[PDB]
Amino acid sequence: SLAPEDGSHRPAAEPTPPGAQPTAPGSLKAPDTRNEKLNSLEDVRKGSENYALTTNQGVRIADDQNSLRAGNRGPTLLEDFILREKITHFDHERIPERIVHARGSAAHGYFQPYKSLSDITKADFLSDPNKITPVFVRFSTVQGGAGSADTVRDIRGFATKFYTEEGIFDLVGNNTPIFFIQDAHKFPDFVHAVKPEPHWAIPQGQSAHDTFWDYVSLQPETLHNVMWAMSDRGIPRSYRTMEGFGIHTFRLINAEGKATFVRFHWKPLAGKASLVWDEAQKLTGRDPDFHRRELWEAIEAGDFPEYELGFQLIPEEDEFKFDFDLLDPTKLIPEELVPVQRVGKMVLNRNPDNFFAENEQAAFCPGHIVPGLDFTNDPLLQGRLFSYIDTQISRLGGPNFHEIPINRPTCPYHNFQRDGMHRMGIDTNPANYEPNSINDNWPRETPPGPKRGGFESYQERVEGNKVRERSPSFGEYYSHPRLFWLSQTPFEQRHIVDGFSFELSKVVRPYIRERVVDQLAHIDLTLAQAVAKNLGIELTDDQLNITPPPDVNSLKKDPSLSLYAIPDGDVKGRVVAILLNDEVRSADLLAILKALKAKGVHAKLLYSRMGEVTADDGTVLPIAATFAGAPSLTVDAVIVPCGNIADIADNGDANYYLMEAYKHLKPIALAGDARKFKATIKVDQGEEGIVEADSADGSFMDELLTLMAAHRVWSRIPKIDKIPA
Amino acid sequence: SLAPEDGSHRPAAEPTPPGAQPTAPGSLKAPDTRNEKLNSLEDVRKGSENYALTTNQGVRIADDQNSLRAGNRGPTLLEDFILREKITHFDHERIPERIVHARGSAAHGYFQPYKSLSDITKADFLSDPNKITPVFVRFSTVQGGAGSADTVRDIRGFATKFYTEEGIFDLVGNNTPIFFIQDAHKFPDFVHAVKPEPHWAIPQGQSAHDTFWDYVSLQPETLHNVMWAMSDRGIPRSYRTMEGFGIHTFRLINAEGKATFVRFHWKPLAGKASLVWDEAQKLTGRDPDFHRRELWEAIEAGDFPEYELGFQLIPEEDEFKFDFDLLDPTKLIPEELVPVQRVGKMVLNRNPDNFFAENEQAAFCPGHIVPGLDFTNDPLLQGRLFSYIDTQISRLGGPNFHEIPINRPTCPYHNFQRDGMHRMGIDTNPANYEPNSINDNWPRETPPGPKRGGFESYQERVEGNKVRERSPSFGEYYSHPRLFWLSQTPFEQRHIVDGFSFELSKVVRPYIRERVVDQLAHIDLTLAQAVAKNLGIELTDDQLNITPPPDVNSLKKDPSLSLYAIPDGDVKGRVVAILLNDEVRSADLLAILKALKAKGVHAKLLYSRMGEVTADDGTVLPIAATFAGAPSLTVDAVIVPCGNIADIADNGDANYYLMEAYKHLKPIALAGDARKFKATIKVADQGEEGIVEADSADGSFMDELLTLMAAHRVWSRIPKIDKIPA
Ligand code: HEM
Numbered sequence A: 001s002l003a004p005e006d007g008s009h010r011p012a013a014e015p016t017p018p019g020a021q022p023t024a025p026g027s028l029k030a031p032d033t034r035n036e037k038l039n040s041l042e043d044v045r046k047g048s049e050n051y052a053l054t055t056n057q058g059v060r061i062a063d064d065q066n067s068l069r070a071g072n073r074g075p076t077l078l079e080d081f082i083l084r085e086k087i088t089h090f091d092h093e094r095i096p097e098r099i100v101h102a103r104g105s106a107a108h109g110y111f112q113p114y115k116s117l118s119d120i121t122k123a124d125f126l127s128d129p130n131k132i133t134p135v136f137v138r139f140s141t142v143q144g145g146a147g148s149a150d151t152v153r154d155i156r157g158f159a160t161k162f163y164t165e166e167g168i169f170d171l172v173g174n175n176t177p178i179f180f181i182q183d184a185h186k187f188p189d190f191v192h193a194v195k196p197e198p199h200w201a202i203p204q205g206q207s208a209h210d211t212f213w214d215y216v217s218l219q220p221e222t223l224h225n226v227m228w229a230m231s232d233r234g235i236p237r238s239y240r241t242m243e244g245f246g247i248h249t250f251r252l253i254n255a256e257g258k259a260t261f262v263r264f265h266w267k268p269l270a271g272k273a274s275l276v277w278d279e280a281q282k283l284t285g286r287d288p289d290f291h292r293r294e295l296w297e298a299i300e301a302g303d304f305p306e307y308e309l310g311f312q313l314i315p316e317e318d319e320f321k322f323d324f325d326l327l328d329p330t331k332l333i334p335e336e337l338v339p340v341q342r343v344g345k346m347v348l349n350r351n352p353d354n355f356f357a358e359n360e361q362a363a364f365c366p367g368h369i370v371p372g373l374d375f376t377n378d379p380l381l382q383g384r385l386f387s388y389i390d391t392q393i394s395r396l397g398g399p400n401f402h403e404i405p406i407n408r409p410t411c412p413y414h415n416f417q418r419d420g421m422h423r424m425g426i427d428t429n430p431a432n433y434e435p436n437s438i439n440d441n442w443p444r445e446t447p448p449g450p451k452r453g454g455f456e457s458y459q460e461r462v463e464g465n466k467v468r469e470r471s472p473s474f475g476e477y478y479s480h481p482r483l484f485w486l487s488q489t490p491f492e493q494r495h496i497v498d499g500f501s502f503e504l505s506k507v508v509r510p511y512i513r514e515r516v517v518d519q520l521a522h523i524d525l526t527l528a529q530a531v532a533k534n535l536g537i538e539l540t541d542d543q544l545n546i547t548p549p550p551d552v553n554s555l556k557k558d559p560s561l562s563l564y565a566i567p568d569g570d571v572k573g574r575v576v577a578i579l580l581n582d583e584v585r586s587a588d589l590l591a592i593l594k595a596l597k598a599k600g601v602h603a604k605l606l607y608s609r610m611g612e613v614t615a616d617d618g619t620v621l622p623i624a625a626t627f628a629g630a631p632s633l634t635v636d637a638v639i640v641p642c643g644n645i646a647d648i649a650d651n652g653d654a655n656y657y658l659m660e661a662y663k664h665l666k667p668i669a670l671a672g673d674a675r676k677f678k679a680t681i682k683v684d685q686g687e688e689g690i691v692e693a694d695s696a697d698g699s700f701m702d703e704l705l706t707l708m709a710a711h712r713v714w715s716r717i718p719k720i721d722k723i724p725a
Numbered sequence B: 001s002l003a004p005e006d007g008s009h010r011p012a013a014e015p016t017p018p019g020a021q022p023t024a025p026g027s028l029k030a031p032d033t034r035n036e037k038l039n040s041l042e043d044v045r046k047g048s049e050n051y052a053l054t055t056n057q058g059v060r061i062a063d064d065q066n067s068l069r070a071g072n073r074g075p076t077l078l079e080d081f082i083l084r085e086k087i088t089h090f091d092h093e094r095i096p097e098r099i100v101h102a103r104g105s106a107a108h109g110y111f112q113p114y115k116s117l118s119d120i121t122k123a124d125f126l127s128d129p130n131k132i133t134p135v136f137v138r139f140s141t142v143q144g145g146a147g148s149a150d151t152v153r154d155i156r157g158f159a160t161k162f163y164t165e166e167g168i169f170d171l172v173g174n175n176t177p178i179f180f181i182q183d184a185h186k187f188p189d190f191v192h193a194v195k196p197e198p199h200w201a202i203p204q205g206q207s208a209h210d211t212f213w214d215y216v217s218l219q220p221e222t223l224h225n226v227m228w229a230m231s232d233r234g235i236p237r238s239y240r241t242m243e244g245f246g247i248h249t250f251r252l253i254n255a256e257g258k259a260t261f262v263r264f265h266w267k268p269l270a271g272k273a274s275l276v277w278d279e280a281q282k283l284t285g286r287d288p289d290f291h292r293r294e295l296w297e298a299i300e301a302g303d304f305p306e307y308e309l310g311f312q313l314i315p316e317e318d319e320f321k322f323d324f325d326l327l328d329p330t331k332l333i334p335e336e337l338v339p340v341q342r343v344g345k346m347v348l349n350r351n352p353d354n355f356f357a358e359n360e361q362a363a364f365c366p367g368h369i370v371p372g373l374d375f376t377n378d379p380l381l382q383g384r385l386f387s388y389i390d391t392q393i394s395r396l397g398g399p400n401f402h403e404i405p406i407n408r409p410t411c412p413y414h415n416f417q418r419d420g421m422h423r424m425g426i427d428t429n430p431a432n433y434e435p436n437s438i439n440d441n442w443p444r445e446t447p448p449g450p451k452r453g454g455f456e457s458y459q460e461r462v463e464g465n466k467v468r469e470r471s472p473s474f475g476e477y478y479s480h481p482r483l484f485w486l487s488q489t490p491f492e493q494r495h496i497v498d499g500f501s502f503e504l505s506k507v508v509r510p511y512i513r514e515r516v517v518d519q520l521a522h523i524d525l526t527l528a529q530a531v532a533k534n535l536g537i538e539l540t541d542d543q544l545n546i547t548p549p550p551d552v553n554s555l556k557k558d559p560s561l562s563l564y565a566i567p568d569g570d571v572k573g574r575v576v577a578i579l580l581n582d583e584v585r586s587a588d589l590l591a592i593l594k595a596l597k598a599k600g601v602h603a604k605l606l607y608s609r610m611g612e613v614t615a616d617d618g619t620v621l622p623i624a625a626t627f628a629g630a631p632s633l634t635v636d637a638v639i640v641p642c643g644n645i646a647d648i649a650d651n652g653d654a655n656y657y658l659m660e661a662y663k664h665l666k667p668i669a670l671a672g673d674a675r676k677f678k679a680t681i682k683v684a685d686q687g688e689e690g691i692v693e694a695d696s697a698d699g700s701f702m703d704e705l706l707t708l709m710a711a712h713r714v715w716s717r718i719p720k721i722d723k724i725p726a
């Protein structure tokens, strides 16, 4: 009898925009949204409604408020089995977090290819355009714990579990196309350096400390993935607005046994967008769950995250054609030399029911491949194949982690494997070995073949001695950092300079700072000088004379490496803050919202207090948040309609919201008297990125939506140093 | 060699101010700080200098950069035993974090009593003023994960491990004197409610979501601890600047067998200080490891955290002489009815060497008591006794967690317990059971005695029927929250109203907000009216007519419940930001620093870039951090000296630096042309209380600034920050 009579506790099982309703588990939120993986999970879902509360043994509980005691004011009794089971289960809730990418957010989806790829690979999931494969995707950061913030400067993980007809395929990618290290053997050294320092366990979610920059300074192979990290790539606006990459070269194998080299790409259909550092660092304070929240809400809204799977393809005879080793994971393949051809579409359309059961327990391993794919001798990748199965024995508590429901294949699985902790499968097979006659040798081996064949490795030639030795072909470190750098817009280049500058400023030992700078002189002198000047370091004459590295196969730049050089903006799923007053002009707010709804743009209505305001025309407006409660940090744009502006004109928080939005390069739109706010951000004829008009004209809504399509107002950067926000 | 020639890589083994040197494991940083427990760990401490790099089996590694592979562009081989060992170890580094109080920072220290307490207890470690007991202290939040932020709004844990001669005593406490719930049976319900919500695991380190307040609204026993939480107690300035409480009534037992009732207190020598919320929420962004870092750095500097252990003592016959029940842990004992007798002093004086080894693996339990102490029937505490041992099994991977070194007793430990995962002790006893004749029954039972006796429970009379039932004497929920609210300052009350309003602001279902407000009308109408207004709620005529709850044993208020009502200010260990310019007035700096050193106040010098600047008298000043890099959030005060003020006058980061500190009520001092900054903070020519100003910083200027800091924050300023866009 505790629920409200108006039924305001329950959300609607309808797509609703962010903040409209309580968020719910996905099967309640969207019961009609289905795929084969999600239908297969019905057998393990527990309901709640109209159920007696029980122990795990099915015994109904009379009193869930009290321990059993020898009297009212008595001591608690050992015999209280209901108390102890409840506490015992609570005391054992936690399991070890992932050693890396502990922080992650996940959703169910489906994948479909555009056309049969059966010419280049015999993988069943790429075999036909009508073949629809369920996926589960987890996006993550890298350094921080499960309880760390989302919008840190870090790499992001992009791992995809394809539940195919011929097995699970895990594509375990990152949001940059390279990694920091060449050889798996040094993964703990590099991960120990970026991680919090072992004496005092500081700092969390930050590469900005001494041990990371010490390692980078002594291992220049790192410098290419560090540039990406120090770029706006390091702080994305959303998981929906970043690129995914496989990073390693892998193989495709077709029915003839012909092997094609591949690199995997995810391209975001919503386009690439990133935060700026001041905004990102502050947002870890205002909303540490910002990416996790944004993603759940985009999906509850129907703003389904969409990505296009892309292949970079290289014939086997083309292995040595480039200036870099294809097996080197610190080098990218420029899109200018090898294009991405579109392979398929992935759509994330449903949230999970239980984060711990589905996200936290989900296990990806890049070793999970299917017939039609295969590895290469990329010596980072070779090392990963051992690690992902080893870690699950402790993290998921045994070798039966595949029987945990999220991890189960939809396709059939039968073998002679037996027992292990938390064994779920009860095998009826008389034989637990092959060859056997007592079960006629079932289940049986399948020979390799074009469809439904057994897995067989590509018969790659191996010649050479047993050595622990780095290929000399890997021993070039500066030319790809340089290609990346020259491919960036000038405003991206300052953001990179500022990232290096900020992080190095945090480094306590100055010699570590000086060595990182000396490494930068080897990539480009302009970038190297701009950092030295922010650190009060002066380049020597030797440093000034360092010859630039070769370009990569004759390229001066590649613009596919920039987030913004070629615009790809889509406003659908973006959010505007609307700053109300106590007597809002109804005409302005009516026009504003119908323009946003038309382009799938969301709004939140903000005031100095919660509850309701009334517009000039009597309309009751409910309030989503306070100006302090949902700061500018959390929106793409700000719109102030006309009304009793006097009401908010001297409001400290209302003026700061405009200044915070303005400093962070966001579009700002002012109608009527709202223009008087132009004084707080020191703007009168007006400027690019401030939309102003007598009323929210509809041309006014067109100017604002056009700016939102370009994501930020880069022209504004020269003005923001003056503004104290 | 990879190290610099100059030796700038190694910190000095002598105390230094924060930022002066790189931080170090405590045994490198302070090798001559010792106690019996730090000396006991010497057997497991592992050096690194001048040693061969080896496998765990002690095989020397020749090449630590490469997998073994067939050809230098070849596949990795299974037979590489060195790579697999390194990867495996890495692949298995994490253990589960604690279910609650996962986020924490800890340190070694000692405890000494002021005088022999054998009159009221036979606890050996309280027996003698010369008895020095080593400790390990862990401070924590409650809700957040091990990787969540320090300065969130939350309860803080204050756990103390005493290594006594008669066994380990863990006093496991929180920074408020009550808890949210009465019976341990509902702990999982309350924790599930305050924790991130199960569908999407949002939000981290916050109680500002629907399920916590849904529970608060439907369970009014919660309201007293919610009041402390919504107050500035929820956002302390430092672990050094908060109080500690055991919460439960415990028993002291003396040699004669007399039981005395006790509640435990930790009184901070550095005094009580707290953040403001806007400042604290932002610090979780700018520096989420702020409490952890400050603790480590205070100790590296020599500003030791110090606390006074205090007892509230109730003789057994007074058990019913309060109009609240002593065994209810949502109820507090007012220091006005029962004063805290300061009984001893604890000092935290050494950082650990390895955070995982000592902090993360440290296990505390309220069941770990020693002869001279006993329990009560407090039903929250009764439940705790089961849980602390139970999680330790999964979290530290078996029943041998006491053999993890930081957990080990310094006193002798011998029993018939055998085996278990990772058993370290090799037992030579021919017997693994008693009674035995084969070892002559060693080891042996000890009869209870005044000193070095066996533990025997206090023979408390039990009369009742087996019931799952809540004492009706527990069912009064508003009178302690009222006593707390009346005991606060007007600015403290404003901050509580703001705490409730901001958090209920983030509650999505308005009926939950209406419901929490209805509860506040049962506590106090003024507080209920101010929260409803901030939420656009109108109290009904009914809500307006709700009778206030009665006084607690007729106290009108208790100023011990307030952080600021009585000044306890100590500025030793605080920090000042000094905002530099490219030609600083040396006269201003020379006075600013001389006065801070004298009071033990730290300074970090700040500029628009790193490196150095030169003073007008030719002094080279090293820059500690940028304005952006060390925001106002991280300092107690800001002083701006004279020099070339034009250099930073148009600097947005520098103006905003002063605007943030002003909004957060911090003291600001401006000398000479620095006064030109008064305009950014909208201070008039006439000046205002809380802005120190003079044409040079001569003596009166610093005495004015340091006086403001003793008062911690400028409360008079709260009406003037409405009109600052910061
Ligand atoms: C290009 C290089 C790498 C990429 C792109 C990569 C990618 C990822 C991703 C996306 C995850 C998170 C999966 C999830 O969300 O659950 C992850 C986790 C992990 N990675 Fe990597 N990784 C790389 C290199 C390595 C290496 C060299 C090692 C060790 C040899 C390693 C060991 C692990 C482990 C232990 C986890 C946690 C495993 C688990 O509990 O499931 N990774 N990696």
Ligand code: HEM
Binding pocket: A087, A091, B097, B098, B099, B100, B101, B104, B138, B139, B140, B156, B157, B158, B159, B172, B173, B174, B178, B179, B184, B187, B246, B247, B248, B329, B362, B363, B364, B380, B383, B384, B387, B388, B391, B392, B395
């Ligand atoms: C007044 C009430 C309570 C206080 C003051 C309190 C205090 C604490 C503190 C300070 C810690 C952290 C210890 C550390 O740093 O290692 C802790 C941990 C814990 N508490 Fe509580 N607690 C209370 C109630 C409860 C209750 C009722 C339960 C369970 C029924 C409980 C279960 C736990 C558990 C399981 C841990 C984790 C311990 C570990 O993993 O080592 N607590 N508590």
